[PDB]
Design a binder for this molecule. Structure first.
Ligand code: NA
Lengths: 276, 100, 9
């Protein structure tokens, strides 16, 4: 049903006067489609999905111009933030910016976002109304006063409610075969005898898209979190995702336990039970 | 300055079958800052031809990367992922377990 | 597509 377009910018200063490194990646849902990397030779926005390669030279020329403009702002922002936090040039520092839009089933606007981080913590964020700002600390209050007086929220709002949604719809139709799919998880359970006294049940979900999934354990139909382990959802490298959930159980009590899988691609949520 | 140490998973793209071509993945996530060294090992030796994804980051600002290489598992060959980061006083080695 | 207008912090 619902969809998102998100861009992720990472700008890292070098010790001393070295040029910073600027990285940009774009996603539709869990599917990467563009990259920029100032360390690479091209100095161009580059395609990273087959369906974006159909866009002509005007598209690539435009995205390259814009991403270089973003890098020049981030270059100055690294300098300003060293000033606001009284830091020397000798240390490497990071700015991050994430922005984009979500649409529902009707492919109409649902929400926009723009968030900015310095050295791995919040710095400033646009609130959900796309009209006002959250400053994380006293330095960010300067940025907030500046961006309010300049009506920066109005400019972002026009992009997030307008451009961002119009292009997400174009990408969804042009990349339909890859972006409008759900790959249901391939599921199975394993059993490993840790000792004579305990066994590990491991519930597996493989080859699914999109990445959003819930794996839970139950014992006699009640939630079980004690003696369970859940790994982070991980990319397969082929456009699909993987995840597992394990529970350590007393030998002879395996049949009390069920694994539960929820995913957009499943007709119905799955219940797995260890079968000898 | 907030720093975060990487999480590491080592796994195959497809279910491992001895003598069937596959991909060996090392997924590093949850770390900050972005500079990280990732080697894939075969019997303790660094594998020279390894590729990785474009840097991206999560809702908590922490970075993630996939490192990967084409490989043909056998019964006896051991694989591992070796990670260094400013948060680690020495490199962390996670072995590939077929069933993880 | 990305945006063009990026006011410094
Ligand atoms: Na280190």
């Amino acid at each position: 049903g619902s969809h998102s377009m998100r861009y992720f910018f990472t700008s890292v200063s070098r010790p001393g006067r070295g040029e910073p490194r600027f990285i940009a990646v774009g996603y539709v849902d869990d599917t990467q489609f563009v990259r920029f990397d100032s360390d690479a030779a091209s100095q161009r926005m580059e395609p990273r999905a087959p369906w974006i390669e159909q866009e002509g030279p005007e598209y690539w020329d435009g995205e390259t111009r814009k991403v270089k403009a973003h890098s020049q702002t981030h270059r100055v922002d690294l300098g300003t933030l060293r000033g606001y936090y009284n830091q020397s040039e000798a240390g490497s520092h990071t700015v991050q910016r994430m922005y984009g839009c979500d649409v529902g089933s009707d492919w109409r606007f649902l929400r926009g976002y723009h968030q900015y981080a310095y050295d791995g913590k919040d710095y400033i964020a646009l609130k959900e109304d796309l009209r006002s700002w959250t400053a994380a600390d006293m330095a960010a209050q300067t940025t907030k006063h500046k961006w309010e007086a300049a009506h920066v929220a109005e400019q972002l709002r026009a992009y997030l409610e307008g451009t961002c949604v119009e292009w997400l719809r174009r990408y969804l139709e042009n990349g339909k075969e890859t972006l409008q799919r759900t790959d249901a998880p391939k599921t199975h359970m394993t059993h490993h005898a840790v000792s004579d006294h305990e066994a590990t049940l491991r519930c597996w979900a493989l080859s699914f898209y999109p990445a959003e999934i819930t794996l839970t354990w139950q014992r006699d139909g009640e939630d079980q979190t004690q003696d369970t382990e859940l790994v982070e959802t991980r990319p397969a490298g082929d456009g699909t995702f993987q995840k597992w959930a394990a529970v350590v159980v007393p030998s002879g009590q395996e049949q009390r336990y069920t694994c539960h899988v929820q995913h957009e691609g499943l007709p119905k949520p799955l219940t797995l039970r260890w079968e000898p | 300055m907030i720093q975060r140490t990487p999480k590491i998973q080592v796994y195959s793209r497809h279910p491992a079958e001895n003598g069937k071509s596959n991909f060996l993945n090392c997924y590093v996530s949850g770390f900050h800052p972005s500079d990280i060294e990732v080697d894939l090992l075969k019997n303790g030796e660094r594998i020279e031809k390894v590729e990785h994804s474009d840097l991206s980051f999560s809702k908590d600002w922490s970075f993630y990367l996939l490192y990967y290489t084409e490989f043909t598992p056998t019964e006896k060959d051991e694989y591992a992922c070796r990670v260094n980061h400013v948060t680690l006083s020495q490199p962390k080695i996670v072995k590939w377990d077929r069933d993880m | 597509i990305i945006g063009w207008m990026w006011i410094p912090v």
